[PDB]
Design a protein around this ligand. Structure first.
Ligand code: HEM
Ligand code: HEM
Ligand SMILES: Cc1cc(N)nc2cc(-c3ccc(OCC4CC4)c(CN)c3)ccc12
Ligand SMILES: Cc1cc(N)nc2cc(-c3ccc(OCC4CC4)c(CN)c3)ccc12
Ligand SMILES: C[C@H](O)[C@H](O)[C@H]1CNc2nc(N)[nH]c(=O)c2N1
Ligand SMILES: C[C@H](O)[C@H](O)[C@H]1CNc2nc(N)[nH]c(=O)c2N1
Ligand SMILES: [Zn+2]
Lengths: 411, 411
């Protein structure tokens, strides 16, 4: 019941007690493990909301060494009253900041959580319109980008009320490149965003129909029809991709944006649901070069890079894909570092995460971790997380998946 | 009840009903996933339901369910268990059992070959010399002068747990490892503990870097005995690189035949504690794990030095670079010597084909994503984007504790 995890590279063994505080459900049973399913998983009644708040306020007041104190009981009863009356409640700013930091701390699929307590929380709960959302999101981007010295940030828009007044950022990330299907066959730009790039045009966007066109923001306030806004290009920091050894690399004409900013997730704190909460940090190199460039359903430039390297692409056993994959990821890290844009390689981030596990087992009793997502998508076994046993479980506050709004919005 | 898995690269969706026939437990619960945990004397009381389930399976597969042959076989085993507290498998049952243990091995990426298993019945064996003879013939047959063939040799099943047959080697062919007084290791660090046992048992250790270990074989619960595999039976491949002429000078070689010998074969509640099985290598087993794991031969540094890489900062990806070169060399060397080997791209593609076929004709294929995905270049292989369900089916290969930890020494 006090589970142990072993690192098989170092024989270090940590004891996990945090999992016994786990609330939600993983998707697995004693007969079937679903740990490789991408997604297991419209208002809260007054009865379910009350214990969710108590649990959250219990852990908040414990974290500041005031469990069972004046302020604790008072806040407990004050929230209790507010729920009985209004059917919901409002977080104090301190609770909001704690809640968001701990949603990140609890994100079992996130390798970058060593930074969890340094989150800059932007309270956008007074926002009322998509123009206002646009303003908050522009200020978020500017602050997070910081001329390339990237800083972690979240911007939290008004919480769900009755599911009819939802704030939503329709983009999956604040900054993404357009993808257009060609009349002949293949896809121009980013194929992962073809449907979204379509809903934009299909909503009025004038697409430059280039390869790396930054998509417009499609912002939904208080449940109304979403509105298009173009992020000021001077706010979108991009990095041209060159290789430190191969001069022809620059000629491929590739670039990527510096700010990874996920905007389609739901932030749950003390039972309250924040359907619009774009958060951002900085990239791990493999997220751009392994996945964005080399996935078959993405930019798929592997074949091209290998032809330019004069590699034998006739049999898989030459490992030409593997060789080109490494070069591409050397270039991405070289480019970002040359332009002084924050980035981390997968060796550094996974080493950081092992230290973070060390810290969480020591000062907290464990750290929920999803091995399938923590291990980087290349060179997996030469990174220290590969040989690290991890326990995955769901702690709240948390970031959760939510349906794409166009499947849901009574347009 | 049906369960669905989705390939996020092809959008292919498969339906799993086979998990309903699942007996044992996974280690997971509704509130915790143990999917990355490495490791998560039987009485008549519980034996006959396990026999009956196996025989029902066996007779279904031969389209004789409910037949008089089926019913008589059930009665026969029933009477044999009542009277002897165990039972013997017919030859046909043993062969079916061993193939299905492999077919059910959720961590095995090579299962497309499962129906082509050569089963060697060694249940008439009685002494360690007899085990040496059977194992020698296994190695000769499986090796087949480099045209490798899958095989398994099955020694007598457990009776009271006090008369076990065991192969103390983790694999039939493995290289010795010697801890030096200065803390360094000569040979394979993975085998230091077993090398020491062998030396203590009387092995004259040549103390080189690539010494094939002796067999340490235990018949009928007696003390184990040492045997030297005839070196002409041990096929080996010098490692060279097709472009780098200095690679041969590293002095690396590896053996052709992966033959795992420390696992337990479970068939109808019978336990075959000595059942060495062999196939052929996926390149990464040698070139990623055996050579580049920090706790193994760990030749990344010298390969990187001789490539004259920037080893100062990890963000140069010098480790990823040297890992690919080593894996090219392993594949090149085996193919040049006409020793069967499969690269990870071909092996993973075949597994997807196998897995789809198994869903179509069997209702499922239990599969352990954490183990199926190769330890390098993960996301550019098709299994990375493949959702999988993990569950335990019997017949099965189980882990068992090393025998030196449990053996009662006769002396
Ligand atoms: C600061 C540097 C950060 C790095 C290097 C990083 C890295 C990653 C990576 C590599 C993944 C796997 C996803 C994929 O491979 O596509 C991930 C997942 C995730 N990240 Fe982080 N991240 C960072 C910051 C943050 C921040 C600031 C937040 C929120 C405040 C966050 C929340 C999440 C969540 C919620 C997930 C997974 C969603 C889930 O659990 O289902 N990350 N991160
Ligand atoms: C013939 C070509 C084969 C290939 C290429 C292959 C490949 C692999 C690999 C890469 C693993 C993961 C282990 C590791 O990474 O160290 C594995 C696991 C395993 N393989 Fe295979 N294998 C083959 C044949 C066989 C055969 C013939 C058997 C038994 C008759 C077998 C039974 C297993 C078992 C029991 C496991 C552990 C599975 C578990 O615990 O669920 N394999 N295999
Ligand atoms: C702040 C941040 C920085 C970073 N460097 N990386 C990040 C990656 C994700 C993330 C989480 C889930 C996810 O996908 C899961 C979806 C259910 C399928 C994706 C990929 N869109 C990205 C979220 C935040 C990230
Ligand atoms: C026939 C065969 C061929 C091959 N090409 N590869 C194989 C790899 C394994 C295997 C299974 C488990 C395992 O490790 C399990 C850990 C104790 C829990 C290892 C690591 N040596 C290898 C077993 C058989 C293999
Ligand atoms: C900690 C982790 O579960 C452990 O290192 C596993 C991960 N996946 C693996 N996958 C394969 N194929 N082989 C292994 O040895 C391992 N080791
Ligand atoms: C099927 C599989 O679970 C899916 O492709 C996952 C695997 N692991 C991953 N891991 C990370 N970090 N990011 C991903 O998108 C995925 N995709
Ligand atoms: Zn699980």
């Amino acid at each position: 019941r006090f589970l142990k995890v072993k690192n098989w590279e170092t024989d270090v063994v940590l004891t996990d007690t945090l999992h016994l505080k786990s609330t939600l459900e993983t998707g697995c049973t004693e007969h079937i493990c679903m740990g490789s399913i991408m997604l297991p998983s419209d208002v809260r009644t007054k009865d379910q909301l009350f214990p969710l708040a108590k649990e959250f306020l219990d852990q908040y007041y414990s974290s500041i060494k005031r469990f069972g104190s004046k302020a604790h009981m008072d806040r407990l009863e004050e929230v209790n009253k507010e729920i009985e009356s209004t059917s919901t409640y409002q977080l104090k700013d301190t609770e909001l900041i704690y809640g968001a930091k701990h949603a990140w701390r609890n994100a079992s699929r996130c390798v970058g959580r060593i930074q969890w307590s340094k989150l800059q929380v932007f309270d956008a709960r007074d926002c009322t319109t998509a123009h206002g959302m646009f303003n908050y999101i522009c200020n978020h981007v500017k602050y997070a980008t910081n001329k390339g010295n990237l800083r972690s940030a979240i911007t939290i828009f008004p919480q769900r009320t009755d599911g009819k007044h939802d704030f939503r950022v329709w983009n999956s990330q604040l900054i993404r490149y357009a993808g257009y299907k060609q009349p002949d066959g293949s896809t121009l730009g980013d194929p992962a965003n073809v449907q979204f790039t379509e809903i934009c045009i299909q909503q009025g966007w004038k697409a430059p129909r280039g390869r790396f066109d930054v998509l417009p923001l499609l912002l939904q306030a208080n449940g109304n029809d979403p509105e298009l806004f173009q992020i000021p290009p001077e706010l979108v920091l991009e990095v041209p991709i060159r290789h430190p050894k191969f001069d022809w690399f620059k000629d491929l004409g590739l670039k990527w944006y510096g700010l990874p900013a996920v905007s389609n997730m739901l932030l749950e704190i003390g039972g309250l649901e924040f359907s619009a909460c774009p958060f951002s940090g900085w990239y791990m190199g493999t997220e751009i070069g392994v996945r964005d460039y080399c996935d078959n359903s993405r930019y798929n430039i592997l074949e091209e890079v290998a032809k330019k390297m004069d590699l034998d692409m006739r049999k898989t056993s030459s490992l030409w894909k593997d060789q080109a994959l490494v070069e591409i990821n050397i270039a991405v890290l070289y480019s970002f570092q040359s332009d002084k844009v924050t980035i981390v390689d997968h060796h550094s981030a996974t080493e950081s995460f092992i230290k973070h596990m060390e810290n969480e087992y020591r000062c907290r009793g464990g750290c929920p971790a999803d091995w399938v997502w923590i291990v980087p998508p290349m060179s997996g076994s030469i990174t220290p997380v590969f040989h690290q046993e991890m326990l995955n479980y769901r702690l709240t506050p948390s970031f959760e998946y939510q349906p794409d709004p166009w499947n849901t919005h009574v347009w």
